[PDB]
Design an enzyme around this catalytic site. Structure first.
Site, mmCIF file in Angstrom:
data_model
loop_
_atom_site.group_PDB
_atom_site.id
_atom_site.type_symbol
_atom_site.label_atom_id
_atom_site.label_comp_id
_atom_site.label_asym_id
_atom_site.label_seq_id
_atom_site.Cartn_x
_atom_site.Cartn_y
_atom_site.Cartn_z
ATOM 1 N N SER A 8 0.828 -1.187 0.000
ATOM 2 C CA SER A 8 0.000 0.000 0.000
ATOM 3 C C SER A 8 0.872 1.249 0.000
ATOM 4 O O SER A 8 0.384 2.334 0.344
ATOM 5 C CB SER A 8 -0.904 0.005 1.228
ATOM 6 O OG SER A 8 -0.202 0.249 2.445
ATOM 7 N N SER A 9 2.162 1.142 -0.327
ATOM 8 C CA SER A 9 2.979 2.326 -0.338
ATOM 9 C C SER A 9 2.976 2.912 -1.752
ATOM 10 O O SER A 9 2.126 2.548 -2.573
ATOM 11 C CB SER A 9 4.348 1.936 0.127
ATOM 12 O OG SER A 9 5.191 3.069 0.276
ATOM 13 N N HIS A 10 3.876 3.845 -2.068
ATOM 14 C CA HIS A 10 3.860 4.574 -3.335
ATOM 15 C C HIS A 10 3.660 3.779 -4.609
ATOM 16 O O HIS A 10 2.809 4.172 -5.412
ATOM 17 C CB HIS A 10 5.148 5.399 -3.459
ATOM 18 C CG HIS A 10 5.231 6.557 -2.459
ATOM 19 N ND1 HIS A 10 4.542 7.700 -2.449
ATOM 20 C CD2 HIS A 10 6.111 6.611 -1.400
ATOM 21 C CE1 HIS A 10 4.978 8.434 -1.452
ATOM 22 N NE2 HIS A 10 5.928 7.776 -0.827
ATOM 23 N N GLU A 32 -1.773 -5.504 2.220
ATOM 24 C CA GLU A 32 -0.777 -4.833 3.018
ATOM 25 C C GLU A 32 -0.497 -5.681 4.248
ATOM 26 O O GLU A 32 -1.406 -5.894 5.047
ATOM 27 C CB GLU A 32 -1.310 -3.452 3.415
ATOM 28 C CG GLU A 32 -0.388 -2.681 4.363
ATOM 29 C CD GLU A 32 1.053 -2.607 3.873
ATOM 30 O OE1 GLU A 32 1.300 -2.177 2.746
ATOM 31 O OE2 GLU A 32 1.934 -3.005 4.629
ATOM 32 N N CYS A 42 8.226 9.698 3.809
ATOM 33 C CA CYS A 42 8.778 10.973 3.365
ATOM 34 C C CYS A 42 8.430 12.117 4.302
ATOM 35 O O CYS A 42 9.199 13.077 4.374
ATOM 36 C CB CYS A 42 8.265 11.219 1.910
ATOM 37 S SG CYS A 42 8.356 9.715 0.894
ATOM 38 N N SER A 110 4.657 -4.449 -5.386
ATOM 39 C CA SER A 110 5.579 -3.383 -5.031
ATOM 40 C C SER A 110 6.074 -3.641 -3.601
ATOM 41 O O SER A 110 5.692 -2.916 -2.663
ATOM 42 C CB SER A 110 4.850 -2.040 -5.140
ATOM 43 O OG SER A 110 5.652 -0.891 -4.840
ATOM 44 N N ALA A 113 11.542 -2.227 0.133
ATOM 45 C CA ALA A 113 12.856 -2.450 0.677
ATOM 46 C C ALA A 113 12.765 -2.335 2.179
ATOM 47 O O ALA A 113 11.803 -1.780 2.718
ATOM 48 C CB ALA A 113 13.813 -1.397 0.156
ATOM 49 N N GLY A 243 21.431 2.260 4.576
ATOM 50 C CA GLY A 243 20.905 1.928 3.263
ATOM 51 C C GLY A 243 19.690 1.022 3.391
ATOM 52 O O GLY A 243 19.101 0.884 4.469
ATOM 53 N N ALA A 297 15.858 4.642 -5.637
ATOM 54 C CA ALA A 297 14.803 4.443 -4.668
ATOM 55 C C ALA A 297 14.107 5.735 -4.251
ATOM 56 O O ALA A 297 14.371 6.270 -3.165
ATOM 57 C CB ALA A 297 15.413 3.748 -3.454
#
Ligand SMILES: Cc1cc2nc3c(=O)[nH]c(=O)nc-3n(C[C@H](O)[C@H](O)[C@H](O)COP(=O)(O)OP(=O)(O)OC[C@H]3O[C@@H](n4cnc5c(N)ncnc54)[C@H](O)[C@@H]3O)c2cc1C
Length: 447
Positions: A8-10, A32, A42, A110, A113, A243, A297
Site C-alpha cells: 500500500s505504499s507509493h 498490506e 517521506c 511493489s 525495501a 541503506g 529508490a
C-alpha cells in the site's frame, strides 16, 4: 479481470489508482501486511520536528476510502508466496493465522525495501533504531524529548541520515554522523555544495566523522559507545541509516532476481513470469542521463512505474519514458535540489563530464533581498548536451531544477539553455536567470 496489488505504499497505491480509472470494471484486491495503509515515510522529518503533530495524518490514503471506491483492502495480510504458472498467491492473515490461496488474472507487486543493519558485535543492545515506517517514527519521536538522550550517533550520511541528524540537533541533542564515505550527501551533491552544508551542520553541533568503519556497539544492556576503526563515540541512541535491502528473498526461485536481490523487469514493468509486474524500490528504472538502468529508490519513481504497470497490463504498449533522478531537500537554512549526473554518478557509471559552477547573488545588486545561490551545470564534453545540474541557496530556487530535468530528457545543449526564454522581473531574478547564467559560462568555456 481480477488484479491483485501487493503493497500500500507509493508503487502499489498508484497501480490501484490507475486501475480504477483504466479498468473501473475490475475486481481489485489490495494487500498490506502492515497495520497501517499508506503511511508517508517521506513526511517522517516534518513529524519529528513537530511541524506535524499527529503521526496518523502522515499518510495519503486510508483503507476505508479505497473500499468506498470498490477496492477490497486486506491489511495485516501478507502474501507469502506466488505460484506464477497457476496464477495463485498464498496469503496469510496475520491476526488469525489463517492461510488461503487466492487466484488472479494479473498481479502487480511493489514489495519495497527494508533498512540495512550492521551485523556487528553489540548488534542489538537497546536504543539502536532504524528509520522506516510508522513504528520507527513513533519511537524516534519519543527519543527526541527523552532527557536521558544526550548523544545520538547516526550511521550513514545520505538523505535519510542527514534528515535524522537535523531532527535530533533541532531537539537539542549532540549529534555525530559517521560514514565510510568522505562527504555527506555525496550521492546527491558535489564537493562545493557539501563543503557549505558541512559548515552549516557543524554550526548546529553536528559532528561529521567521515571515512570511518563502524566495528562494534558497546554498552550494558543498552548502547553506550559506537567504536569505529579510528575512534569511539559516546551514544545514548544510534539511528542506523546506512541503506536499504530489497524485500525479495521470499521471491528467490519464483522470479528472476539480479545478484543484488533486485527484481528483473523490462521497460513495460513485466517480470520474468507472465502476468506479474513489479514496481518501486525493489526494481531498476531507465535513467535517461546515462541511457542505462539504475536503482533509484525514490517515491516519484515508484508512483510512475505503478501507473505504467497498469498501462501495460494487457499489452506491452507503453514503454517507460525514463527518469533523471531528481531530488531536493532543505538542510537547516539551505534548500538544494539536483538531477542527473554528478561526480559520484559519473564515477560509478564511468561517464566523462564537464561542468561550470556559478556562485553569485540571484537578484540584481540594488535589490536588498539578494542572496547567494550556487548552481552547477554538468554536460557532455563532446555533444555539450545537458547531463545534470545542482543548485543551492537559502532562498528557495529549487523549482528551477524541474526545467533542467526536462532539458536532459529533451537532450538540449548548453547553447539551448544559454538563450532559453526565462522570464525576468527584478523581485524574482536577474535578466539572465540562474540557468541562463551558468549555461552562458559553459558556452564561453567551449569557445
Ligand atoms: C525516511 C525516508 C524519507 C524519504 N523521503 C523521500 C522523499 O522525500 N522523496 C522521495 O521521492 N522519496 C523519498 N523516500 C523514498 C520513498 O519513500 C520510497 O522510494 C518509496 O516508499 C518506495 O515505495 P515502494 O512501494 O516501492 O516500497 P515501500 O515504501 O518499501 O513499501 C512496500 C510496502 O509493501 C508491503 N509489503 C511488502 N511485502 C509484502 C508482502 N509480502 N505482503 C503484503 N505486503 C507487503 C510493506 O509493508 C510496505 O508497506 C524516503 C524514504 C524514507 C525511508
Amino acid at each position: 479481470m481480477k488484479v491483485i496489488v501487493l503493497g500500500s505504499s507509493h508503487g502499489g497505491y498508484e497501480a490501484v489508482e490507475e486501475l480504477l480509472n483504466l479498468h473501473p470494471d475490475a475486481e481489485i484486491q489490495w494487500y498490506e501486511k502492515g497495520d497501517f495503509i499508506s503511511f508517508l515515510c517521506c513526511g517522517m522529518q516534518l513529524y519529528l520536528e513537530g511541524k506535524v503533530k499527529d503521526v496518523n495524518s502522515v499518510r495519503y490514503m486510508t483503507g476505508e476510502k479505497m473500499e468506498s471506491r470498490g477496492v477490497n483492502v486486506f491489511s495485516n495480510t501478507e502474501i507469502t508466496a506466488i505460484q506464477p504458472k497457476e496464477h495463485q498467491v498464498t496469503v496469510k492473515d496475520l491476526v488469525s493465522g489463517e492461510e488461503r490461496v487466492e487466484n488472479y488474472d494479473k498481479l502487480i507487486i511493489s514489495p519495497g525495501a527494508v533498512p540495512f543493519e550492521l551485523d556487528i558485535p553489540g548488534k542489538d543492545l537497546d536504543n539502536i533504531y532504524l528509520m522506516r515506517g510508522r513504528q520507527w517514527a513513533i519511537k524516534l519521536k519519543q527519543k527526541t524529548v527523552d532527557p536521558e538522550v544526550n548523544n545520538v550517533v547516526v550511521i550513514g550520511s545520505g538523505y535519510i541520515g542527514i534528515e535524522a541528524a537535523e531532527a535530533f540537533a533541532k531537539a537539542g541533542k549532540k549529534v555525530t554522523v559517521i560514514d565510510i564515505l568522505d562527504r555527506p550527501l555525496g550521492v546527491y551533491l558535489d564537493k562545493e555544495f557539501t563543503d557549505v552544508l558541512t559548515e552549516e551542520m557543524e554550526a548546529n553541533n553536528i559532528t561529521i566523522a567521515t571515512g570511518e568503519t563502524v566495528e562494534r556497539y558497546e554498552g550494558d544492556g543498552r548502547v553506550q559507545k559506537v567504536v569505529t576503526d579510528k575512534n569511539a563515540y559516546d551514544a545514548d541512541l544510534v539511528v542506523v541509516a546506512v541503506g536499504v535491502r530489497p524485500n525479495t528473498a521470499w521471491l528467490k526461485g519464483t522470479l528472476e532476481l539480479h545478484p543484488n536481490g533486485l527484481i528483473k523487469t523490462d521497460e513495460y514493468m513485466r517480470t520474468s513470469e507472465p502476468d506479474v509486474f513489479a514496481v518501486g524500490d525493489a526494481t531498476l528504472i531507465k535513467y535517461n542521463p546515462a541511457d542505462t538502468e539504475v536503482n533509484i529508490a525514490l517515491a516519484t519513481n515508484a508512483r510512475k512505474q505503478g501507473r505504467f504497470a497498469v498501462k501495460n497490463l494487457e499489452e506491452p504498449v507503453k514503454p517507460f519514458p525514463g527518469v533523471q533522478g531528481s531530488s531536493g531537500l532543505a538542510v537547516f537554512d539551505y534548500k538544494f535540489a539536483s538531477t542527473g549526473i554528478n561526480e559520484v554518478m559519473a564515477q560509478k557509471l564511468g561517464k566523462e563530464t564537464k561542468a561550470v559552477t556559478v556562485v553569485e547573488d540571484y537578484l540584481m545588486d540594488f535589490n536588498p533581498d539578494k542572496q547567494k545561490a550556487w548552481f552547477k551545470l554538468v554536460y557532455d564534453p563532446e555533444t555539450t548536451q545537458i547531463l545534470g545540474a545542482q543548485l543551492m541557496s537559502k532562498a528557495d530556487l529549487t523549482a528551477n531544477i524541474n526545467a533542467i530535468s526536462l532539458a536532459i530528457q529533451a537532450k538540449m545543449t548548453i547553447e539551448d539553455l544559454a538563450y532559453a526564454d526565462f522570464f525576468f522581473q527584478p523581485a524574482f531574478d536577474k535578466p539572465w536567470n540562474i540557468i541562463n547564467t551558468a549555461a552562458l559560462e559553459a558556452v564561453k568555456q567551449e569557445r
